[PDB]
DNA sequence: AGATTGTGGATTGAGA
DNA sequence: TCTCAATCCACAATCT
């Protein structure tokens, strides 16, 4: 296994997932839809590194703020479910812009905090 | 068959 | 020097 860090946008995966969910019409998205919407946020995600898609999937399950909503309520073991975000479960500091080489390269193109786009 | 989803074991390494 | 978000991977389902 060859671990590598990539020049991803200077926001946590949690923050970006939460932003796309909260800015969707029904405040819920399938994994496939989350991945498509994240890809539109920054050109990085359209590049040839695709492992971020795995990181997003991992994050949905690992953080308690993301709550699966069954696509079919009679199939609790079905997949392709919707995901929601409970903002009162978000660790607020994970919504701040990160201090990384990417943000230091160009601070002005990155909002300092995503909380205004996630909380009502 | 086939591709994706949902969850977790585990290591990595820059920011702090 | 220590934290934990980032990242790579297996597993075991469903999906097709
Ligand atoms: K979760």
Numbering used by the authors: 90 to 209
The authors write:
Forkhead box H1 (FoxH1) is an essential maternal pioneer factor during embryonic development that binds to specific GG/GT-containing DNA target sequences. The members of the FOX transcription factor family share the presence of the forkhead domain (FH), which interacts with DNA (InterPro entry IPR001766). Most FOX proteins recognize the canonical forkhead DNA motif TRTTTRY (R = A/G, Y = C/T). In contrast, FoxH1 recognizes the TGTG(G/T)ATT sequences in several cis-regulatory elements, such as in Gsc, Eomes, Nodal, Mixl, and FoxA2, to confer activin regulation in vivo.
To decipher how FoxH1 selects GK sites and how the extended domain contributes to DNA binding, we determined the crystal structures of FoxH1 proteins from three selected species, H. sapiens, D. rerio, and X. laevis, bound to a 16 bp native sequence belonging to the mouse Gsc promoter containing the GG site. The three GG complexes were refined at 0.98 Å (D. rerio, C2 space group), 1.47 Å (H. sapiens, P21 space group), and 2.8 Å resolution (X. laevis, P212121 space group). The atomic resolution data of the two GK structures, with average B-factors of 19.3 and 17.0 Å2, respectively, allowed us to determine the position of each atom of the 32 DNA nucleotides, 120 protein residues, and 360/219 water molecules in the GG/GT structures, respectively. In the FoxH1 complexes bound to the GG site, Wing1 and Wing2 are well-ordered and, together with the N-terminal loop, they contribute to specific recognition of DNA. Wing2 starts with two 310 helices (H4 and H5), followed by an isolated β-bridge formed by Lys185 and Asp202 in zebrafish and by Arg121 and Asp143 in humans. The Wing2 region also interacts with minor groove 1, directly with the backbone (Gln187 to A6′, Asn188 to A16, and Arg193 to G15) and indirectly by guiding the N-terminal loop also towards this groove, where it establishes several base-specific HBs, for instance, between Tyr92 and A6′, and between Arg94 and T12 and G13. These interactions are well-defined, as depicted in the snapshot showing the atomic-resolution 2Fo-Fc electron density maps of the zebrafish GG complex contoured at 1.0 sigma.
